[PDB]
Symmetry: C7
Subunit: 254 residues, 7 copies
């Protein structure tokens, strides 16, 4: 009877010294690893309150008090902390998944669901990537894994799609001749792949030719800019008119 | 009383020699399987902390301290890891579902909810597919199973829909005659299927004929381009005018 | 004391032979039914690891070690696999619900929440349906049950709605006379149902008559196309003008 | 010792014969009710595997093996089936709620969050409703309860809102006189309720009068069509002009 | 030994008679209060199956069979019914909270996240409200509590905002004089509150004055209509022009 | 044996009298605090059913239910109530957060994710706030914590941004001179802060100057209105034209 | 027998004095910390009711009444409070994550998914940040972690993108010469990085040159404004016309 009481006080004193030991130990461990001391002491007070809660419940169990009430409420409070940390630990799990199944490496130009940039680093909780215009975007890993990963650096060839609106009076064969001469005289265009120049659309004010052209993934934007400037030059020289928005107006004297 | 004593320490030392050996074993196993050697030791430290937690709880239970507090908090922490890994393990389950119920195979041109490409591979956690313009999209499997799978390589015949806007003054029977001559003289159009040429819409500035035409799944875009170019040529030759946006203007000199 | 040790090793050996024979049996059942070998051996390794986990826990319990730690973590790992498989087993439950409460059968042209096609088959995890333009859409059953099911093959008679924009100067009674003559002389229109021709809207540039017309579900699109072509013909013959977008211009010379 | 073994084999044989008899009984109970046999045999195999799992667990417990691991994993698999059936059983609960608290009955024209039609039947898992244009929409009950229920057949009177755009030069008092004569000479308009004819908006090209008019729920669309046709007739007769889109243009030079 | 068997059959017979009496009593209670019997018989069959399940597994426990596997599956089926009834019970909890914290009473014109109407009644599961145009909307209580409650009947004074577009040629001080004379000569406008007449915006074709004016919550729409009609009258009398959409057109004849 | 019977009937009678006492006390406390007799009687009936459920189970346990059948079902029914209560008391937790972290509690004009107004009161489940146009919006606290809080009375100085579109013929230095004279002669503009007058955009028909100007949080709307009216006055006085939507028009033949 | 009754009353009295002392102690602890007593007494009454509930259940267990029913309902109520506090404790966990993995510090101009401003402080539950236009936005931490963190202060160099629309008649080489002279004569433009001046687009009415220019993060907006004003000045001096929206008008003249 009193043996359970002295055993319970023994559990209390060993639990308090273990609580102070583990609390100060994780204080030292987060001062050494991390930098902050305020939230380190906050988490250390959380762990200290956890160990003294564990040992107070174990002591009230050693006395003989049926202790399942605080067991159920402490389990639901741990489950509260669990459904809280669902997002952060999901970022952790997506991070280890994204570094063991790696669809991008540090330097691969990707498009992670609406933002596109070169991956500077894949950390444990987030990938830092630098945008094309200098912005640093720190995307969490759950937002990456839960969406698509459009990797632009895994295939060495990509495809420019030019859409040229010419007038309806413009001859289809002359436009196709000039566009084929432009995309054939250009050296960075892969000739062994698709080189489509065909009438894509009968537009409202114009008529739209599509020019689908494969090139290297590094020369892609320069092929777009050079073939577009050459299209403008050769079309203005050859008399083919890029039309303005056209209206037919039926005038009426009131 | 002493039977619980150092026999509990025998449990706590038979557990540490299992914890270290299982940590070293999963380090060697994941170095053999998928080398990272930097989050591999983190997962090994997680498994080590789990096994030493199991054996510390079992040793405190063998002594006589009623362990149901750390049991409930460890179960809630396991459920935290569970609701964390909900997304990744749902990708795994959707991957084994997608490879045992396979709606696409490696090479089938599909459309998985807004992105469309040829599936290069269906891995365990993601399908890599190459877009029509060269981009590699690594879609997770839960995002595929949670949405539609529009497969273009399962049926060998598909349907082009042309919408030709002609002027309101143009004769309906002449447009239907010329469009039927275009879709009948074209050989890749399946003649035993639907060949609809009918007045679809009375538009604002135009009047829209629909041309629904069945052709083979490989010949489909070429049928679209050739029949559209032939429509432009034969309509310009026959005098039917594709109209511009039309306005009726009632000018008022003020 | 040692009786529990030899009993624990007995549970160990019967569990290892059970872990071999159940894994071999599910390899048999997955090679015969739903044929695959790689992910079938993956699932077999999962079932083998599960059975050896069950029997290692049972052996450590039969020895005398309080084993509730791995019980709670294994229950939370089962709950991890459960909240993972939530989506796939919800597709399973929605599939058996969709086939025992069947709102569509194999062949019924439906509209399952933004995609519309004829249901080729209702499988256990997904309905395959062929779109009107040849595409095969494999919709999961949870996405079908969680949204509406617009069935076009359940009523034999449906309703075309024409909206004819005529000019503001056109006589309302002449337009109603001509539209009623068109929808009365057409034989596939159900005359015993609603045949509405009334002035629907005072539009911006036009004035919109509505023509609500009931006809059979197979003849519906042909009734639409024939009555629309007849509307264009008879309105052009009778002098009623479908107007262009109208502007009133008050020009004032700066 | 061996008494527990023969008792365990007794539980094994009574559970196997109970599993076979209850699988045959649930097969009869489904084939009499829902006359699909394939998914009936699937659910029967599920119930058979569940009861033989129950009795294998009970036998391994009666032998003396601590059968807590398979109980925890089986409870988590029951929770897998539970979070799976969350959607379908939520449709069931919303169906019994929607038929015991019934905001619509079979025949009542409603608008269940988007789609709008007359409810043909409220079943247990879904309400079938027929749209105004003939389409059958089978809406699940959770989608109905989770959204608004805009019931049109609960109140016998409703309100038409005409918006008449007249020119800026038109006299406000003459428009209000003519609109009040139109909405007063019409007999299906409830005269004891609100009859608003007032200047609602100073539009861009027009000026918008609102006409808010109460009438019976069956006469509502006919009141709209007749008062709109009368508005067009009397406004064209009295010289009030529904204006086209108006532009003030300041002409300039090159 | 046989004492447990006769005790188990005793629990069987008392549980079957309690199951029949509670099933028939719940059926009678759902007849006298919930007149529909087609789902009352189903709910009573559910309660009957539940009580016979409880007493069958209680008798299987009283025999001596370790029964804690069907306890886990039954407690997961109860949690299936729980996560099913999550929506309906959330409507019940939001209803009792919406009637003990009442932000609207029966008759108060509100806007419950989108739809807006006068609350006819707040029931336990839904608030019925009549729209301004006669429609009856039965909003569930979880959708009300989860969103905003814009109550228009809690403050007796509200604010009209007129936005008058005048021409750029119009004098600012004359427009402000006429608008201030209109909003000062009007008696239902609260003169002790804000009366703003100031230049709000330099629009594309016009220039927009804002007139923010406080008036009583019942007189608000009539103040809007009377001040807008007076603005049109006084501005047409004073020569200030409400401008049409303006274009500056540069002639480029060739 | 019969001692457990008389003890069970003792538990029955003490539980029934405690049920009546606690239900009467809860009805007293609810008719004192949160007065509504109908739903307080409903909640007291729920608490009465709960206490008679607890005591019927606790009495029938010793003569019966054999380790937690009805307890395992009642715990899941408690969690059924608990998911409803998590949806509702997420507002209570957010309310005690919103009071102990005090982001707007005094009456500060804020913008709580969309709607914006002066906070009338922060209650326990909702913040009532009065909009700028008189509407009372009762936002729940979970909707506030789940979104941003844009507090306008936390910083005493804020920023007006004028965007002035002038013509392309306007001299940039003259526009910058006049705008700097307007924003320098105005006394409520903070001159020690940013005063930006620079060419923001080359518009389609205009050219847009940005005027970023810091002023006090009370004087800000009056600074906007006064500087905008002064911009219109001085720009019309100095010959700088606010352009209409310009449109170069190239004439053609029929 | 009576020893359990006097022990139960002992637990009752020690739990009541412990409940009063912990309730008043957390009143004192919060009044020292956060000095709203009105919710401090609310939380203190919650903790008092929790401790008296724990000790009432412990006393009913020490008497001998099987008390697992209220254990299950109290655990489900703890899970109700936990899943209610899910969002608040997720903000807490995201706050300690955001301060131990800090992607922004106090002062770093960021864009936290939409809103963008300089982070004034990162607290435990929210980050306060001041917008560029003076507004104070208190973003919760879970909303920050759940989205991207676009940090503008981590890289010292960023990129302006000018899009200059010139006329179609303008010479491409003259525009590229003038734009290269502007972006080369400007000193704050980083010349060792990308300096792109190339033909980006053939627009509808214009033709769009892109000018991608790298400059320091503090000089970025001033580089944009200075190069845009210089583009307007030098282009008007050199005769290059920024075109208005262009229409081609075909006179039909009825």
């Amino acid at each position: 009877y009193a043996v359970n009481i002295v055993a319970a006080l023994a559990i209390i004193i060993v639990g308090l010294i273990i609580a102070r030991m583990i609390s100060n130990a994780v204080n030292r461990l987060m001062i050494s690893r991390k930098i902050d001391a305020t939230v380190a002491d906050f988490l250390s007070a959380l762990v200290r309150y956890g160990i003294i809660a564990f040992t107070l419940i174990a002591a009230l169990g050693r006395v003989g008090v049926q202790t399942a009430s605080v067991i159920a409420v402490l389990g639901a409070a741990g489950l509260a902390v669990g459904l809280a940390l669902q997002g952060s630990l999901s970022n952790l799990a997506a991070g280890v998944l994204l570094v063991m199944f790696r669809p991008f490496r540090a330097g691969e130009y990707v498009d992670l669901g609406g933002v596109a940039g070169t991956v500077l680093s894949v950390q444990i909780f987030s990938t830092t990537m630098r945008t094309a215009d200098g912005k640093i975007i720190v995307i969490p890993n759950g937002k990456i894994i839960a969406g698509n990963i459009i990797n632009f650096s895994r295939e060495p060839v990509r495809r420019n799609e030019f859409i040229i609106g010419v007038a309806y009076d413009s001859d289809i064969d002359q436009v196709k001749q000039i566009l084929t001469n432009i995309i054939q005289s250009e050296d960075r265009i892969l000739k062994d792949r698709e080189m489509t120049v065909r009438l894509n659309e009968l537009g409202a004010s114009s008529i739209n030719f599509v020019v689908r052209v494969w090139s290297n993934s590094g020369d892609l934007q320069n092929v777009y800019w050079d073939v577009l400037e050459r299209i403008k030059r050769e079309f203005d020289a050859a008399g083919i008119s890029f039309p303005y928005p056209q209206m037919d107006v039926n005038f009426k004297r009131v």
